[PDB]
Structures are given as C-alpha cells and as structure tokens.
Amino acid sequence: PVPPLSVRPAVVMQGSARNQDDLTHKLADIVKINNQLRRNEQNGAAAHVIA
Amino acid sequence: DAEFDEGFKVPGFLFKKLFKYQQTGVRWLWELHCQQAGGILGDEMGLGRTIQIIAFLAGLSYSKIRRFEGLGPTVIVCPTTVMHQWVKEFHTWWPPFRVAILHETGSYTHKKEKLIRDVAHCHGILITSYSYIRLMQDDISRYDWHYVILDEGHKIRNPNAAVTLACKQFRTPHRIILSGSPMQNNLRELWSLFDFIFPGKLGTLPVFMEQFSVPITMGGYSNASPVQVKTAYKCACVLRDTINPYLLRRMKSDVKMSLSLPDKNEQVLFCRLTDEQHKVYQNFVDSKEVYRILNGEMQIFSGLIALRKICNHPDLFSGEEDQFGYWKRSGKMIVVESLLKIWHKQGQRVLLFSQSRQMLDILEVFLRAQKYTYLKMDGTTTIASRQPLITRYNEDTSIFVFLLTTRVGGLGVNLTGANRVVIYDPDWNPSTDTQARERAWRIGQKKQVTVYRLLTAGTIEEKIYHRQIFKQFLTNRVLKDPKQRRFFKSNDLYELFTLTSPDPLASSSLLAKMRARNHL
DNA sequence: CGCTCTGCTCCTTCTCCCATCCTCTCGATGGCTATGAGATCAACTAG
DNA sequence: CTAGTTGATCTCATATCAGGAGAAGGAGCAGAGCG
C-alpha cells in the first residue's frame, strides 16, 4: 500500500523546487526496483540477478 | 503439374514460373504443413519470399487437401506499406483467391467485424497490418484461421510488445514468418520469432537466454577467454541444428549464379566534421549534460539523441544563405552534394536514406536548393499514396533522387529503379540499414548498384557503427556460420561520448558426434 | 542399555527505553528521470 | 463524398570506551522412565 499525498506532503521551498518526503523517495526506490525486477523476470536475466 | 509426397499438386504453369530455389521453398513449406509446424522464410530480401507463399498456398488450395477442404480462411499480417502489394501479388499469380484488405483504406466500407466474419466463412485471405492485429486480438482470434503468415515478421521480435502477444494468440500450427532478417540485435529476438512459429522448440525465454544467449554472446567479445569462445561455438552450433528445419534462409550467394543479379558494392565514406559542426560537437561532449549522463544520473537516451543530431546536422542551434538546414554547415551534406552532383551528371537514379524524419526534411529543402527532382516518402506521407509513389518512381526515370526514412523505406518495397544507394545516417540496428541498402539490389535490378555509408569519423556515429558491426557478427555467428571472427576492434563501453577526429545412426556416429561437441 | 523427553542452567542475542516545556541561531538540502517514427483515428479543411 | 492535413495519442525501439534491563532461543547436559 502506497499512502496518499497527505501522509507524504511535497513541501514547496522558498522558490519552485518541490521537495519530496522521505516516504516518497523510498517509494521511488521501491517502484524502481519493482519495475526492474518485473522486466528482469519478463526478459533475459540470470537467476542470481533476479535473486 | 508438380507432385510432392502425399497429395500436394501445384499447377505446372505456376511451378514453371518459379525458380529452383522457390520450388524448394514450396516443398519446404509443404513439408512443414505436414508436420504441422511453422517456419521462417529467411530468404535474403529481393529473392521474392512472397512469390513462394503464393505458390504454396495456391498449390494447397488446388490440391484440396483434407475440418478444412483444402485451404481454410487465412490471415496475412504485413507492414502497412505493402498490403496492396500483396493484394496485387495474389491477384496476378493466382486470381481465384479472395484477398480482403483490413484497413482504413480497405475496400469494404462497412464495419470490419463483418469483414472478418465474411472471410472466416467464405475462406478468403485476409490481409492486415500489425496494428489491426494488436487492436482486434479479440475479434480476430475467434475464427479458426488456417494460416497466419506474418510478413516482415521481425516486428514480433519483442516478446513483450503487445503486437507480439496478439500474434501469439493465434491457435493454428501453420504459422509462417517471412523475415529477411530474423535476428537483428540479439537472440532474444530469435527466440521470440521461434516462439511464434513453434512455441516450444527453443524453451522458455529465461531458459533460452541462460543456455544460448549468454554463451553465444560472450563468445563474441574481444576479451573473452578461449574457453568461452568454444562454449559459444558449441552453443551456436546447437542452435543452428535446432533451428535448421524451421528456417529456410537462402543468401544471395547460393542463388546468384542461378539468378544473375548485377554487381553490388558496399563502399563506406568516413566523413569529416566541419568547423561549425566540430565546434558544436566538441562543446556538447564537454557539456555538463554529457558528464551527468556518464554519471548515470538520468537516461542515456537523451545524450545519444543529442549526439546523433549533432553529427547529423547542427540542428541543436541554427545559424541570408545561412538558413536552417544549410548544406555547407555540415560535412556529410557536403559529401552528399558532391556525390549527387557527379551522379546527376551520370544521368543516374539515386536512393538516399535517413534514419531520421526531420532530417529527411532538411534533405528535402536541400534538394530544393539544388535542381534535383526527388520524391520523399516517410511515415507522414499517406499510406494510400504509398504504393503508387513507389510505382511512380520505378516507372519513369524523371525522378532522380528518392528521399526515404528507413522505417517505411525498408520493409518489402521494391525500388529497382534507383541505381545508387547512400545510407546517410547510421542506426543502432544493423538490419535497418541492411534492408535500406537492399531496396535496390533485388530481382529486376538490371543495372549496377553501389552502397555508400556516410559516417563521421571519431564521433558517436563510428561507435554506433561498431555496435551494429558487433551485432552483425553476432547474427552471423548463428545464421551463416558459427566460425565468426571475434570483434577485436572495441571493448564497447560507455565512452562513446568523445570526439577524436582524423589526423538409423549406428551409435558410433552418434557417439563420435557427441564426443566432438563435448570436446570443445 | 540405549533411546527418548523432558527440564534446568548458561549464554547469547535481541529489543526496548531513557523528564517537561520553551527560545534562538546556523548549515544543508533541497533534481530532472528524454526522443523520435509510424499507425489510428477523429476532426476539420479544402476539393 | 474524398483526399489532405493536423492534432493527439498510442506503441515500439534504441543503451550500458561510562547502558541496563528483561525476555526468547538455543545448547549442553543430568537424569528419569522405559522398551
């Protein structure tokens, strides 16, 4: 379960740079590796790579 | 008539029109039909893969082989350019079949599903495109097709594309691929093609990679240990043996004496980057963006696009008589000017290809700037105007040069009218430029043709050239012969951002064969 | 007479917790993740 | 009606040290039935 935006608000700094929450960065890592694992299982990858 | 094993009689007049190799093909296709297996017609383009299908299906219908009384409803999936070409071909080489086109152009002018039903009931030959296959996997895969020919079937080379899955939803065993190059980048493409034609032969995709792609690839690298070279050699031979029955690949050397093609040439020209071109390239390689890409902070593709553009023309930045797309601003355009000058003086028809589409526009405005009468043909040119454009260019010699994007420019069009071919822009895919250059040197090309590959020395394009060479060697190692020489020129790393301009078997035959393979 | 099934010890992980509230300053970090060709389709635009 | 044009809009392709306390598990082992 990925929480809503209220639990991880993207606070705007003095300028326009929108800083993301720690939860959002972590979910970014999770989605990155999840997509990476999904393609590695779908396409050519070694068993140790998938592991 | 000509007669084969069980009941296959193909009409004699039709047979006599064929060549010896095309006759072999027809026999091969029928043997597959007997096995109920599929195959890849990997004949080199211009040999006429389509003619063989016409003959075989004609013979099958005529023989009335016994669910189906001869030839049932069948679907042809071919690239959008060539649909009417196939219709024309069926119509001439065998009028009796009904060949319905499934397209916006089409000829039906009602709902399409009615047409699908009509063909599936009256047993026609439904031609369609890969898109309409992707978009009506539901409708189309409800009608017990008898044959599922895919022309230029390499488009199914991605096992996960939607079109691939849609094509692999068809149920009949009589699946055929007509693909001049059934392997273009790596064997994953091969597995995909075999999994359409013959779903189990090469195993699952993971297992295929594990067992074949990894070893065969590792044997190509320059630094590979000899042990690994020999594992690659073994695996490559196993693969050829596995795929031998189901791939009929006649190159244009085992038929040349029996077919009499003209001379072919493959010159390469290492173009030199002009001053402004050099400056923009030298700056952008030194730019922070390239440095960040080297650090892996974002996608590499952006950098590669930028570099290719720079080498292709300074269209990163535009600089009277210095308007956008000015020839003198970029060296390759200077070379093209000289070549088209000499060739126009030779009264010769040229065929200029470009991987890009907007660059095809800059080439177009150039050819306006010159007095060269051209005809341009890319993805934006209407499909209905496509085959008539090809026919027009082939019928008269008034049209001198023929701008082409390689993606529609390749893929089954016949362009025998042109004589000289120049590949202006490299690709990461060797097959693209190969089919491009092969548009001319086909059956019916009654005049000599030479191929010029224009390349920028020391820039990205040379490294892309190295990529497509390494790919070509990998394809050769598994299609033409596994004794390929190792690609020693480069280590093929991410240092391609630099500018370095010039200046019964009786169980002893078996065991002997086994010992041979396992000695490697 | 060896096999089991306790159940005691001892260690060893292993986890958790560490007053309230309030004021100020100061330093760091605060990113996109790209491109283009071809095909469909539906909107107009002209004929 | 019919080509032609034009946006979207999709798909596909390209690359490599001054903590402490308590609770849970495991291991070793004495010993007691017991078959």
UniProtKB/Swiss-Prot annotation, chain A:
Signal sequence segment: none
Localisation: Nucleus; Cytoplasm; Chromosome
UniProt subunit comment: Component of the RNA polymerase II (Pol II) core complex consisting of 12 subunits: a ten-subunit catalytic core composed of POLR2A/RPB1, POLR2B/RPB2, POLR2C/RPB3, POLR2I/RPB9, POLR2J/RPB11, POLR2E/RPABC1, POLR2F/RPABC2, POLR2H/RPABC3, POLR2K/RPABC4 and POLR2L/RPABC5 and a mobile stalk composed of two subunits POLR2D/RPB4 and POLR2G/RPB7, protruding from the core and functioning primarily in transcription initiation. Part of Pol II(G) complex, in which Pol II core associates with an additional subunit POLR2M; unlike conventional Pol II, Pol II(G) functions as a transcriptional repressor.
Free-text note on domains in this protein's UniProt record: The C-terminal domain (CTD) serves as a platform for assembly of factors that regulate transcription initiation, elongation, termination and mRNA processing. The trigger loop allows entry of NTPs into the active site, switching between an open and closed state with each NTP addition cycle.
Primary role: Catalytic core component of RNA polymerase II (Pol II), a DNA-dependent RNA polymerase which synthesizes mRNA precursors and many functional non-coding RNAs using the four ribonucleoside triphosphates as substrates. Pol II-mediated transcription cycle proceeds through transcription initiation, transcription elongation and transcription termination stages. RNA-dependent RNA polymerase that catalyzes the extension of a non-coding RNA (ncRNA) at the 3'-end using the four ribonucleoside triphosphates as substrates. An internal ncRNA sequence near the 3'-end serves as a template in a single-round Pol II-mediated RNA polymerization reaction. May decrease the stability of ncRNAs that repress Pol II-mediated gene transcription.
Protein name: DNA-directed RNA polymerase II subunit RPB1
Superkingdom in the source lineage: Eukaryota
Record family assignment: Belongs to the RNA polymerase beta' chain family.
Curated annotation (Swiss-Prot), chain B:
Residue ranges occupied by any Helicase ATP-binding domain in the UniProt entry: 30-200
Subcellular location: Nucleus; Chromosome
Coiled-coil annotated spans: none
Positions bound to ATP: 43-50
Motif (CSA-interacting motif (CIM)): 507-519
Helicase C-terminal domain sequence ranges: 335-494
Post-translational modifications: Phosphorylation at these two sites promotes the intramolecular interaction of the N-terminal domain with the helicase ATP-binding domain, thereby probably releasing the inhibitory effect of the N-terminal domain on its ATPase activity. Phosphorylation is essential for its chromatin remodeling activity. Ubiquitinated at the C-terminus. Ubiquitination by the CSA complex leads to ERCC6 proteasomal degradation in a UV-dependent manner. Stabilized following interaction with KIAA1530/UVSSA, which promotes recruitment of deubiquitinating enzyme USP7, leading to deubiquitination of ERCC6 thereby preventing UV-induced degradation of ERCC6 by the proteasome.
Intrachain S-S bonds: none
Motif DEAH box positions after renumbering to this chain: 151-154
Reported function: Essential factor involved in transcription-coupled nucleotide excision repair (TC-NER), a process during which RNA polymerase II-blocking lesions are rapidly removed from the transcribed strand of active genes. Plays a central role in the initiation of the TC-NER process: specifically recognizes and binds RNA polymerase II stalled at a lesion, and mediates recruitment of ERCC8/CSA, initiating DNA damage excision by TFIIH recruitment.
Subunit record text: Homodimer. Binds DNA. Interacts with ERCC8. Interacts with RNA polymerase II; interaction is enhanced by UV irradiation. Component of the B-WICH complex, at least composed of SMARCA5/SNF2H, BAZ1B/WSTF, SF3B1, DEK, MYO1C, ERCC6, MYBBP1A and DDX21. Interacts with KIAA1530/UVSSA. Interacts with ELOA and CUL5; the interaction is induced by DNA damaging agents or by inhibitors of RNA polymerase II elongation. Interacts (via WHD region) with RIF1. Interacts with SMARCC2/BAF170, SMARCB1/BAF47 and the neuron-specific chromatin remodeling complex (nBAF complex).
Free-text domain note: The CSA-interacting motif (CIM) mediates interaction and recruitment of ERCC8/CSA. A C-terminal ubiquitin-binding domain (UBD) is essential for transcription-coupled nucleotide excision repair activity, interaction with RNA polymerase II, association with chromatin after UV irradiation and for mediating the UV-induced translocation of ERRC8 to the nuclear matrix.
Family: Belongs to the SNF2/RAD54 helicase family.
Disease: Cockayne syndrome B: A rare disorder characterized by cutaneous sensitivity to sunlight, abnormal and slow growth, cachectic dwarfism, progeroid appearance, progressive pigmentary retinopathy and sensorineural deafness. There is delayed neural development and severe progressive neurologic degeneration resulting in intellectual disability.
Protein name: DNA excision repair protein ERCC-6
Name of the gene this protein is made from: ERCC6
